[PDB]
Symmetry: C2
Subunit: 556 residues, 2 copies
Amino acid sequence: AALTRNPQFQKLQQWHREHGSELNLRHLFDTDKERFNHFSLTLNTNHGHILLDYSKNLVTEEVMHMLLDLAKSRGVEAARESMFNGEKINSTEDRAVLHVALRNRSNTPIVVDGKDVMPEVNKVLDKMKAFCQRVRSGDWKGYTGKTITDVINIGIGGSDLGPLMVTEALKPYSSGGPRVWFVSNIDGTHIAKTLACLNPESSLFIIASKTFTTQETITNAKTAKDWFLLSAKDPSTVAKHFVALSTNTAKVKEFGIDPQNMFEFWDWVGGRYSLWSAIGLSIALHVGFDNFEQLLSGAHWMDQHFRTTPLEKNAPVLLAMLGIWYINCFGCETQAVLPYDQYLHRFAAYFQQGDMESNGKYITKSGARVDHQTGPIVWGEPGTNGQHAFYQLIHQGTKMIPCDFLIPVQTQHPIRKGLHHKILLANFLAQTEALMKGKSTEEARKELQAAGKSPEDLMKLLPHKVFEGNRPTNSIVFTKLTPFILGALIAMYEHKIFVQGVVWDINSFDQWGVELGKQLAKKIEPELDGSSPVTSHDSSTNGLINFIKQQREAKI
Amino acid sequence: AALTRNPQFQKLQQWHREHGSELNLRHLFDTDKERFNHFSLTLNTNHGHILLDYSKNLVTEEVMHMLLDLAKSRGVEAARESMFNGEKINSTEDRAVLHVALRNRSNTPIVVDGKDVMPEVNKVLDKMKAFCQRVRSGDWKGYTGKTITDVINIGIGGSDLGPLMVTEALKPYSSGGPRVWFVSNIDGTHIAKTLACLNPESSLFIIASKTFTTQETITNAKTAKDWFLLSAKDPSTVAKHFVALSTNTAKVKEFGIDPQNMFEFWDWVGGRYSLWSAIGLSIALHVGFDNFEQLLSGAHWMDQHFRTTPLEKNAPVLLAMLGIWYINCFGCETQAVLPYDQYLHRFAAYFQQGDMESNGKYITKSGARVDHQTGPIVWGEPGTNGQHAFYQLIHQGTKMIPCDFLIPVQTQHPIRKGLHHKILLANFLAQTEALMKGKSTEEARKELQAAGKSPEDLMKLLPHKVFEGNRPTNSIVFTKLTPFILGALIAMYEHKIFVQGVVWDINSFDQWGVELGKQLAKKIEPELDGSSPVTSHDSSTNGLINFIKQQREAKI
């Protein structure tokens, strides 16, 4: 495996082995008045500013230089061009990786198999807008003649999380749009509780599935059709309440949907990178096409930043290499994402898929097994919520946890003359300051002394009140969370993920880890039927199945 | 630190040292037909069964004996008795830890400071039931004489997550109950979007806060009151629309709340263990008191199981020691919680707080700094969703991640004649089976050949199709997710957390980690006012504040 044999990597490791544990944030800031200026970057997108302050990280100019050298020697730049140029970098599936084409507002030609993909991309987009216009304006009618009031997206994984996270994040921009719902779990509870709140006469379903044969998605789609038909009765009315995001014309038409209402995307569009394509139809329907195009433009802006900016000042590259530093040198298993924004409550979950499904790999592009760590476990909750739940462990646990704190300067709801947002901002700032600064034993002793504690009571509590600090964080502040800014932020992390994948020499765009569980599930399905004991598996699987057969009848 | 000096621990570590990496699940099952029988526990609660199958773990009977010996030498049994008997085991705050008293259905006396706490516990429960009856029945009217249709819980941390997670989990048992809402984030977006869907004359607010001085909660409460009075206008009507879960009579009365509508709890009720107290009022209002008592009874049943069962067959002890095995011997940073149940969509988030806030500590009860790992990072999303998001990394990443898979045999919505649940169950079973078994190079090769793959295509794909397996999991299956069973499950994990804390010799019931961040935030708040630059902090904190001031009125 390449990384471990790379000269720059070894130099980095050697340096960390010798000076790594010596790095101390408090000391670094105390001896360098220019630290913030030297370890941060402000980006003016013309539609708001984004400040990436990575100064509270365990790095020095020397460390950053070494990290940038590694990025260069790993061919991050050549790899980037290959992606943007339509080359088939998805080596195991022999496919191009072009979510950047989906939002290529510049319409600069991107050729794949001797053909520019932009024309087809724009064809679908125009098709999406036209349809969106009919639904939003009321022109489109239910089988009863009523306008659509609710839109239900049915899909799993990448066909669900992106649309859900974005519509949740851009709720303030949904004025005039129908309400949107998202069904994803095969668990019957999901579709059942969702359908109970809807009127079939004014409900529009969006079945999101490339092949249109995805078990969970199609099962849910069929259940929704039965629910609908229970009221509508006529199978021909389905074409008025169901549309598809797919390419399988036959299966779509067989379902009862009109091929005219099938919005397609391509194989170079990964599920976890597809909200920018037809998959984003529910987004466009909710916030309008102008806002949707703003979302795409934001991503496009960041794509250009990534492609034209020197590595030293390249946002995604910097985030990626800082992550490599903590993952491969410090050995940190996780990456926390803490947005101080309730609208971004599903932002961390979105990147759990985007990051983990992309880089949770162990085989390199050459077929060799890695002998080093790859993708981290991404997790988190919007602040200050999460702040009152698990920060205890971040501040005083036994784990080093890189944290990305994000927040918009301007709130969408400046209630109480901005009092709420002021407090939110203060906590956003105070937490990273606290994680960095900590509170020494002497500092805590003085507080306890001043609190009239007896020598005995003081000694008993003292160590518990000490904060060792030196806990690194990135602070990402943006003017306002608009469709454009959100687009830029999502694209920024998409590229961070891309860069790390290159450094580790893995394929960030396939997902073979899915078939094993899938094949074993299909084998078990028919065995669940009936009350006869199963003995064809390992004793555990056998035991579980038999307990299930025994208890499915139990009358509590 | 006590743990490192414990002889049973050193014996365990030496064994691991010498045998650890040699353990292979597939090989263990292949060579022992009694594995499931030997490593599974079935609990009959008389109100449904709970099967704890821990056979797919990297353990042998020898390993389990060493783990149980460690639990015993660390005094888990005596510590448990001290908790149940009301001793002040919360050593740093010198307080008892009695969430078990809250659900002590048996009413066996529990003495604290020379006084049985049960009378006051039951008094509050009776008060809660009485109030709920009036609200639910429509007896309690708003200032305009209308019945209450919406209940809004305002609180943060332990005063929020439990009530939210339980009401979400028990939705099927809420018929005839008012809609419940939860406001927690200080972020104005939270209270604003909630208030926008409410009618002040039929809305009842529950302000959950012990001291009633919690900044976020009180700020949200004041905003809700201003909103209410904009319509009500008459201050005296507040007593008909606001109640409190607190003990600060002065502040409550000052807020405008009738002190007779203040439901109390005690200092031995930790926030993250408070849903069983008055904090659970929103739960009672949503599902009725009979169901709330079932929830309490379920926890009481698990409490009894924990107190009377020999360690070797004690569910919480087994879960705890398996965790210790992975944390302190294998070095796993995280613990995944994967419930295959949409209703339990906030279950993992709940324990992310319950576990991490309790055991994210680094100072032992003797004041020594731990020289070993403590609490893990808890995370997860309900199965299939999570299954289509990040399982790629669990299956083929470079991290060992213990996973708890949970699922009810009987679904609350057996739609399509049980088809959805059948698929859900098959996946629940197949996933742990796949994680254990994996797929060898030769197995994958055979599949690729049968698939008709060409020689070189097979060669390039082969390694990527291999699953190393040997990934440990616990499967927890229960007859049905009822209020009683849910209570039992929550209590089971609370005790798992307790046992681990005892083994590590830390105080699982304090949370000093909160102080530093709060103190720094209060100092920054006033500095945000005005446009003059701030220079009183480290350059990063300074720079972030100044960017905020600059961008505050940037027009986008």
